Amino acid sequence: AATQQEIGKNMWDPFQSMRAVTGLMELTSGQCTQLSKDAAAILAGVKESHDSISVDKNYKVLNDEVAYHAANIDAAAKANDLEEVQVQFRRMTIACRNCHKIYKTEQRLVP
Amino acid sequence: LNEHTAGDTTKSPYTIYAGLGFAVQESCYYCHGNGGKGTTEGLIFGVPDFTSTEFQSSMTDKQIIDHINKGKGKCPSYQGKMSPEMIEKMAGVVRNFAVK
Ligand code: HEC
Ligand code: HEC
Ligand SMILES: [K+]
């Protein structure tokens, strides 16, 4: 029974770990590794929010669109395709922000 | 209404609702944020509560599509500012604030 705020807190370190790596040319095997772990952490967060936090159907689709891009980052990392990881991370960032702006409109939230 | 399926955020109605390509004061979320219930600014302007069964029963799907096209009062007109397919997706977003 985690709150949405707890889910966001738990997603911040995976998201910021991801952000720190999207701006590199690098393909350290350990960094590709950490990237897949970070993507799975996000997938797990938005699934927990999507499932256990009944708000409305829009809330569910917003979570799904974050998950869409998180899964795409996972696949692009597995394919050693850093260009795509980068583009999908930008788009996931928008997806995170879409829910924040729609449901917590007058609170300043990251990212 | 044609259901929007979750997908790439560059094609999503939520990105438009959250203001992509619009001034803040012409973005749905600025007035219809806080989960469709209305923001401080939106309530000043007189927004209805999208989460309310009584609001939702006051409009047909066609009336929501025609409204987003035409605007009313401080609710801007969006015809020509997004595609007809996006307007229909947006009507689905309005509906979905009351779908529990
Ligand atoms: C709606 C389905 C959301 C999605 C998609 C994302 N977040 Fe979120 N988040 C949401 C709400 C309603 C809130 C406010 C919680 C509250 O206090 O009421 C948040 C909050 C956060 C936070 C702040 C945590 C804190 O210390 O207070 C963070 C850091 C956060 N969210 C991160 C985050 C990320 C990185 C997302 C995409 C991967 C994301 N959120 C999506 C609702 C929703
Ligand atoms: C503030 C400048 C607004 C913005 C930006 C958006 N809306 Fe709006 N909306 C606003 C007001 C003050 C009202 C009441 C209008 C009235 O006099 O009745 C509304 C109303 C709606 C409705 C219901 C239609 C009705 O019953 O009048 C819908 C479906 C609606 N608004 C949708 C909507 C969309 C999809 C927006 C972004 C594309 C949007 N609004 C922006 C205020 C404001
Ligand atoms: K879903």
Side-chain angles (χ1 to χ4, degrees):
Chain A
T3 63
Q4 183 68 59
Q5 186 176 8
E6 275 159 338
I7 290 171
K9 281 178 179 168
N10 294 334
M11 286 203 293
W12 187 233
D13 284 349
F15 172 96
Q16 238 191 328
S17 166
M18 276 174 58
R19 187 158 64 180
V21 161
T22 63
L24 306 169
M25 329 285 311
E26 292 231 271
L27 191 142
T28 278
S29 292
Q31 279 172 337
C32 261
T33 284
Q34 188 59 45
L35 197 51
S36 272
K37 292 160 73 169
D38 292 338
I42 301 278
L43 287 168
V46 299
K47 189 174 197 291
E48 185 176 353
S49 167
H50 172 287
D51 289 352
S52 61
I53 299 178
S54 317
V55 171
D56 65 44
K57 184 171 189 172
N58 284 323
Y59 205 83
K60 290 183 182 291
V61 187
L62 285 152
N63 267 314
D64 290 334
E65 286 192 332
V66 168
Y68 174 84
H69 288 298
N72 283 345
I73 294 164
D74 187 22
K78 292 187 201 308
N80 300 295
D81 180 344
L82 185 44
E83 231 153 80
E84 189 65 13
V85 165
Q86 211 180 13
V87 175
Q88 296 291 321
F89 181 75
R90 157 148 304 95
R91 292 183 187 184
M92 186 189 78
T93 296
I94 293 163
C96 305
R97 280 190 183 160
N98 286 343
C99 185
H100 291 170
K101 293 169 80 173
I102 289 167
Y103 285 82
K104 294 298 274 195
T105 307
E106 316 173 55
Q107 169 181 354
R108 178 202 128 270
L109 281 172
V110 293
Chain B
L1 294 167
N2 285 310
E3 226 50 19
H4 173 70
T5 286
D8 187 291
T9 202
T10 69
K11 312 288 185 183
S12 171
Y14 302 110
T15 306
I16 298 304
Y17 194 106
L20 174 66
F22 289 92
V24 168
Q25 300 166 292
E26 225 193 328
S27 310
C28 319
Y29 84 98
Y30 178 72
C31 302
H32 297 293
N34 295 335
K37 294 177 186 174
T39 58
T40 303
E41 289 85 356
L43 298 164
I44 289 167
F45 298 152
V47 296
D49 178 356
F50 289 166
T51 72
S52 160
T53 291
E54 310 192 328
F55 162 75
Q56 295 290 346
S57 63
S58 78
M59 301 188 76
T60 65
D61 294 353
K62 184 206 191 308
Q63 279 169 339
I64 294 177
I65 289 169
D66 297 347
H67 168 84
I68 295 160
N69 272 288
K70 189 184 179 302
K72 185 175 184 180
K74 300 201 181 314
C75 192
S77 159
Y78 291 89
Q79 190 163 24
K81 300 175 186 172
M82 63 181 84
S83 74
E85 167 177 330
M86 187 56 77
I87 289 176
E88 173 162 345
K89 294 183 181 289
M90 203 64 55
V93 173
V94 169
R95 287 302 203 197
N96 281 345
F97 286 117
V99 175
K100 249 78 85 172

